[PDB]
Scaffold this active site. Structure first.
Site, short mmCIF file in Angstrom:
data_model
loop_
_atom_site.label_atom_id
_atom_site.label_comp_id
_atom_site.label_asym_id
_atom_site.label_seq_id
_atom_site.Cartn_x
_atom_site.Cartn_y
_atom_site.Cartn_z
CG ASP A 188 0.41 4.58 16.45
OD1 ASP A 188 1.45 4.23 17.05
OD2 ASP A 188 0.19 5.76 16.11
C1 LIG Z 1 12.15 17.97 9.93
C2 LIG Z 1 11.03 17.07 9.41
C3 LIG Z 1 10.04 17.82 8.51
C4 LIG Z 1 8.66 17.17 8.48
C5 LIG Z 1 8.23 16.78 7.07
C6 LIG Z 1 6.93 16.00 7.05
C7 LIG Z 1 6.75 15.24 5.73
C8 LIG Z 1 5.50 14.38 5.72
C9 LIG Z 1 5.15 13.89 4.32
C10 LIG Z 1 3.64 13.85 4.11
C11 LIG Z 1 3.19 12.72 3.19
C12 LIG Z 1 1.99 11.94 3.71
O1 LIG Z 1 1.13 12.48 4.34
S1 LIG Z 1 1.88 10.17 3.37
C13 LIG Z 1 0.26 9.75 2.69
C14 LIG Z 1 -0.30 8.59 3.50
N1 LIG Z 1 -1.11 9.09 4.58
C15 LIG Z 1 -2.40 8.49 4.81
O2 LIG Z 1 -3.09 8.87 5.69
C16 LIG Z 1 -2.86 7.35 3.91
C17 LIG Z 1 -3.83 6.42 4.61
N2 LIG Z 1 -3.31 6.04 5.91
C18 LIG Z 1 -4.03 5.04 6.67
O3 LIG Z 1 -5.01 4.58 6.21
C19 LIG Z 1 -3.55 4.58 8.05
O4 LIG Z 1 -4.46 5.06 9.00
C20 LIG Z 1 -2.15 5.08 8.38
C21 LIG Z 1 -2.21 6.58 8.69
C22 LIG Z 1 -1.22 4.85 7.19
C23 LIG Z 1 -1.60 4.34 9.59
O5 LIG Z 1 -1.17 3.07 9.22
P1 LIG Z 1 -1.51 1.80 10.22
O6 LIG Z 1 -2.50 2.27 11.25
O7 LIG Z 1 -2.13 0.68 9.42
O8 LIG Z 1 -0.25 1.32 10.89
#
Ligand SMILES: CCCCCCCCCCCC(=O)SCCNC(=O)CCNC(=O)[C@H](O)C(C)(C)COP(=O)(O)O
Ligand code: SF4
Ligand code: SF4
Lengths: 85, 113, 385, 112, 176, 208
Positions: free
Chosen positions: A40
């Protein structure tokens, strides 16, 4: 320092060896990391950044818009390292 | 229709998220050492992959970009060595009991829904 | 540079601030004032409560002056109910509004002295603030957080004993301020600690909405009494300090003058209280005496109602400023007309000041910063909420 | 002339009258390129004109702050300067089209 | 209506000047101010000798709660449950039930001092003047549990202090 | 009609009214209602796309120097799709006047930030960001005020419980404070004190 091209591809494939998500057989000169490999997008980011970490230079994700074949990775490296010999 | 936050269509947004993942994915060991997390670092990267999975149903680019706005804002508090070790561990909920999705156990537990 | 969290733990931090600095050698660079270490979130807690129930919340924000907060609520509630109190209640609200002002300024003075390490005035004057808490106890049964000021006016009439001793209380107090007159006011060390520190240009103040002595120190003459004598202030004689340099020394001398000013006012409020109800005639807002409720029916009925669902404000959302000694005070009601508020934001005067501190922070050494928090009379309770 | 302005951020600028005539001529200079039709323009005209004549009504700085009925107009030169940047801002707002987009009736339908 | 602070300009006169430089050197006023603190040594200290002496309190003073009885010895409570409607922190909990005699009576009146804010509303609110905010104030406990009062403990509190409570009410009742 | 009643100040209502039509003239493009109650309290609409251009004008003299953003008071009403109701309380010091000028926004509308214009809203910002989600034009940092670190919620949305979903406590073997599911004892025993039978016929929204 010479930055021979075939050895660059050797470097990238060895990074793929160290890389987890790919199957060792799935490793190949041309198969796409988006359109061929089943890994992915986050894996796309994963290899692209491991590789650029090897080459020690930023790869804009616009090149991920490019990317296509790994052959275009080594191709870009020929356009990046600009030694291409 | 209504005017967009930043990105218009997914790719203007998709570009931002990857910027986010690396922004975490490199940052993780820094966090592992600042707070001396007992977690193996790969677990940290795995959690980094997981929180990027919970947001899979997102489809409006304003939702994507607003999520990376808030996520980068969380990264602010992370990198500046704000928070505390506990806050980093809040993502894990390890004190909490595992939830059995199986319906039969849900029968066995309590009144429930 | 060296990143550093400060309080709450510092006595200087007053158990609230965490203003992290990325210090250089000792000169500051970054200096962000984090907050939300006290944020009690009372805005939603006000929403699910009858308007008589909201009343304690304001003793809970300004820890020191108290009656003034409740007066800040009674004005804002009586507006929507269009109710005008019996005069005696207003003479009282001014009387204890000013005694609350004495408590507040004694607080700010002696604590600011403590950060300057003066120690003594503290013990020279809390001996007095117990003398005043004896009074709020005589009129409320509580040494502090007295609920004695109410939207209808006041819970209860003044006990006969006060009227003498309070005079006695202020028979000698001027001397007690003289004892300070012989200290910091004239003292050499003190000027150096505070002179030419945190000077603020008039415009930044007018931008951030600075108010109270914090304006009056830097020369802006804006005031919430004489501009809008919302109560008996119109009848009362007093005169307003204005600073020159914007020196903390200025603001200081102002507060000392206001303390003198309450010495002026409270004299006249002692001089001028009418006999009369200290509550509104209406039983549909102001509850019946225990003597009357226990015979007359309607008194007991409305008694039962105000104590169960209460008066109903006609619907409306409004905002009112208050002449807190610390500055403009925020009463932002949002009422659907039900006794429950729909919403209620509360602007703390100190909120703007703390917003403005970092402007005064950078380019000053840490002692300057410790001077600054005491410059602005900031009790942090009101500020995050 | 009185020593010390009193205020902190404010500072003295001697011969205020001339500097004010500068400001009148300049905010006039910007309102002129603003179209007559914009509702603001006639009133800012009324302001700059009546105030300019009002400055002309008396010579000394002294009673000048009485003639305008405002203490120390030494500040209103600055306010006039805000007025100048404002009039500079009027140009990019263009001539004023009455209203654009309207609330669903539920908005402002107080109570609830 | 405004007043300038400071602003005043010091004399250039030579006597006054040399006097100010004399303050700059010989400190003068420090000692004068210093002298003032000495005055405190000669004053009598203000401490009350707690606990063999105790601070003054008005009869109004609010403290520990206590339910209380009729002179007959019946409990005043009728479970009108408005004091439950007022306790701003909602500490109170009441289950009114019929008496075998048929009278309304609480079966489990209770209140926790953990949530009580001692506003003393309920002292005012009760139609039958049942519950009372008593004089007592000193009752800190080793454990949290001892704070969550039953009707029982409150009744006991009304038992120990009833002389006192009724006495204060005897002092205060006109004002209400 | 007097001893209890607060007298109605018609004069200031007249002056504020006339000035209200005056402003109604001046900015037809965004200004809408010119509300003027007997509290002597004027109010005015603004379209959110018109936030900044109006507000800047306000600071600058016409016959009212709307100096000092005293407040950006905020209200959320779930019924209206434009659920948010951002309000600009204001005070022209020179004219001792007071005014309330409000707007509306949806959940994803980037309403204009007066941060450049007032800077007082560096925090009216982040509170009303955090408590809500009212995204803002361009601010130096949208980091949360008040609410914790990992905290996800937006209280003052008039949504999800007053206790919230979160209730942290120190825990043993993890040696650390940890957020946990609420489990309130006794529960906020809410009283519905709403009264059937309207007391104010003069108001009363028609059944229509
Ligand atoms: C120690 C560490 C601590 C952990 C901290 C975690 C922090 C996380 C921050 C959270 C912010 C978000 O969610 S970020 C907001 C973005 N998330 C989304 O789901 C937007 C739409 N995504 C899609 O449409 C695709 O399916 C996609 C999933 C991008 C895949 O990309 P590709 O298939 O084209 O490669
Ligand atoms: S006091 Fe006695 S009567 Fe009044 S409510 Fe509480 S319990 Fe019912
Ligand atoms: S004491 Fe104050 S808070 Fe506790 S119940 Fe009686 S009134 Fe409500």
């Amino acid at each position: 320092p010479p930055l021979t091209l075939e050895g660059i591809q050797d470097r990238v494939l060895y990074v793929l060896k160290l890389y987890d998500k790919i199957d060792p057989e799935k490793l190949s000169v041309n198969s796409h990391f988006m359109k061929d490999l089943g890994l992915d997008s986050l894996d796309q980011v994963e290899i692209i950044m491991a590789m650029e970490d090897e080459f020690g230079f930023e790869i804009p994700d616009i090149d991920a818009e490019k990317l296509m074949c790994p052959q275009e990775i080594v191709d870009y490296i020929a356009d990046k390292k600009d030694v291409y010999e | 229709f209504v005017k967009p936050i930043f990105s218009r269509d997914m790719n203007e947004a998709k570009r931002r998220v990857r910027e986010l993942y690396r922004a975490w994915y490199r940052e993780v060991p820094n966090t592992v050492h600042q707070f001396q997390l007992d977690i193996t670092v790969k677990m940290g990267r795995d959690k980094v992959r997981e929180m990027f999975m919970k947001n899979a149903h997102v489809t409006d680019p304003r939702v994507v970009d607003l999520l990376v706005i808030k996520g980068k804002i969380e990264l602010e508090e992370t990198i500046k060595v704000w928070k505390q070790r506990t806050h980093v561990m809040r993502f894990f909920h390890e004190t909490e009991a595992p939830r059995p999705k199986d319906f039969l156990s849900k029968f066995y537990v309590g009144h429930d829904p | 540079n060296i990143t550093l969290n400060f309080g709450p733990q510092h006595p200087a931090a007053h158990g609230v601030l965490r203003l992290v600095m990325e210090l250089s050698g000792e000169m500051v660079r970054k200096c962000d004032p984090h907050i939300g270490l006290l944020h009690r979130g009372t805005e939603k807690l006000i929403e699910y409560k009858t308007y008589l129930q909201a009343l304690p919340y304001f003793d809970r924000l300004d820890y020191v002056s108290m009656m003034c907060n409740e007066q800040a609520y009674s004005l804002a509630v009586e507006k929507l109910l269009n109710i005008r109190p019996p005069p005696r209640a207003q003479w009282i609200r001014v009387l204890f509004g000013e005694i609350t002002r004495l408590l507040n300024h004694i607080m700010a003075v002696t604590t600011h002295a403590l950060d300057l390490g003066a120690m003594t005035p503290f013990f020279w004057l809390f001996e007095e603030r117990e003398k005043m808490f004896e009074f709020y106890e005589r009129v409320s049964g509580a040494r502090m957080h007295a609920a004695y000021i109410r939207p209808g006016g006041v819970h209860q009439d003044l006990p006969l004993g006060l009227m003498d001793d309070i005079y006695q209380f202020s028979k000698n107090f001027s001397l007690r301020l003289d004892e300070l007159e012989e200290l910091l006011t004239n003292n050499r060390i003190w000027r150096n600690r505070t002179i030419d520190i945190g000077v603020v240009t008039a415009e930044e103040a007018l931008n951030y909405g600075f108010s109270g002595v914090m304006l009056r120190g830097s020369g802006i003459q804006w005031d919430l009494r004489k501009t809008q004598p919302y109560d008996v202030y119109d009848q009362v004689e007093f005169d307003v300090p204005v600073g020159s340099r914007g020196d903390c020394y200025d603001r200081y001398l102002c507060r000392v003058e206001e303390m003198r000013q309450s010495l002026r006012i409270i004299a006249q409020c002692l001089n001028k209280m009418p006999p009369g109800e200290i509550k509104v005639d209406d039983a549909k807002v102001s509850p019946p005496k225990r003597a009357e409720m226990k015979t007359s029916m309607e008194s007991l009925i409305h008694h039962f109602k105000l104590y169960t669902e209460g008066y109903q404000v006609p619907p409306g959302a409004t905002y009112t400023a208050i002449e807190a000694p610390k500055g403009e005070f925020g009463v932002y009601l949002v009422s659907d007309g039900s006794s429950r508020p729909y919403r209620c934001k509360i602007k703390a005067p100190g909120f703007a000041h703390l917003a403005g501190l970092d402007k005064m922070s950078k380019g000053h050494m840490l002692a300057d910063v410790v001077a600054i928090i005491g410059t602005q009379d900031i009790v942090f309770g009101e500020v995050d909420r | 002339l009185k020593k010390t302005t009193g205020l902190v951020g404010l500072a003295v600028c001697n011969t205020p009258h001339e500097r004010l005539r500068i400001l009148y001529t300049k905010i006039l200079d910007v309102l002129e390129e603003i179209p007559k039709n914009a509702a603001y323009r006639k009133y800012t005209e009324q302001i700059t004109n009546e105030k300019l004549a009002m400055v002309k009504a008396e010579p000394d700085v002294k009673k000048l702050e009485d003639q305008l009925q405002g203490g120390q107009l030494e500040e209103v030169i600055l306010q006039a300067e805000h007025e100048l940047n404002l009039a500079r801002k009027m140009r990019e707002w263009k001539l004023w089209e009455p209203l654009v987009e309207e609330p669903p009736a539920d908005q402002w339908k107080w109570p609830i | 209506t405004y007043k300038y602070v400071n602003m005043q300009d010091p004399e250039m006169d030579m006597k006054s000047v040399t006097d100010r430089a004399a303050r700059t050197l010989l400190w003068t006023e420090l000692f004068r101010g210093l002298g003032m603190t000495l005055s405190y040594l000669f004053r009598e200290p203000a401490t009350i000798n707690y606990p063999f002496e105790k601070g003054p309190l008005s009869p109004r003073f609010r403290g520990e709660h206590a339910l209380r009885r009729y002179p007959s010895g019946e409990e005043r409570c009728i479970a009108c449950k408005l004091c439950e409607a007022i306790c701003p922190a909602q500490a109170i909990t009441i289950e009114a039930e019929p008496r075998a005699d048929g009278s309304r009576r609480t079966t489990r009146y209770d209140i926790d001092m953990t949530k009580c804010i001692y506003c003393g509303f309920c002292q005012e609110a009760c139609p039958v003047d049942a519950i009372v905010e008593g004089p007592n104030f000193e009752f800190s406990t080793e454990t949290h549990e001892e704070l969550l009062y039953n009707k029982e403990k409150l009744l006991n509190n009304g038992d120990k202090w009833e002389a006192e409570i009724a006495a204060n009410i005897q002092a205060d009742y006109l004002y209400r | 009609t007097r001893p209890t009643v607060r007298p109605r100040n018609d004069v200031a209502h007249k002056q504020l009214s006339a000035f209200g039509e005056y402003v109604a003239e001046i900015l037809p493009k965004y200004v809408q209602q010119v509300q003027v109650s007997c509290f002597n309290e004027l109010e005015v609409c603004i379209h959110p796309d018109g936030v900044i251009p109006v507000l800047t004008f306000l600071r600058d003299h016409t016959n009212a120097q709307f100096k000092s953003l005293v407040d950006l008071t905020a209200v959320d009403v779930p019924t209206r799709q434009n659920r948010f109701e951002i309000v600009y309380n204001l005070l022209s010091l020179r004219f001792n006047s007071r005014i309330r000028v409000k707007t509306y926004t949806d959940e994803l509308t980037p309403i204009e930030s007066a941060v450049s214009v007032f800077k007082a809203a560096n925090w009216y910002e982040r509170e009303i960001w955090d408590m809500f989600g009212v995204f803002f034009a361009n601010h130096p940092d949208l980091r949360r005020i008040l609410t914790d670190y990992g905290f996800e919620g937006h209280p003052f949305r008039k949504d999800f419980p007053l206790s919230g979903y979160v209730e942290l406590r120190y825990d043993d073997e993890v040696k650390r404070v940890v957020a946990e599911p609420v489990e309130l004892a006794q529960e906020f025993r809410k009283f519905d004190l709403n009264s059937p039978w309207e007391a104010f016929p003069v108001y009363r929204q028609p059944p229509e």
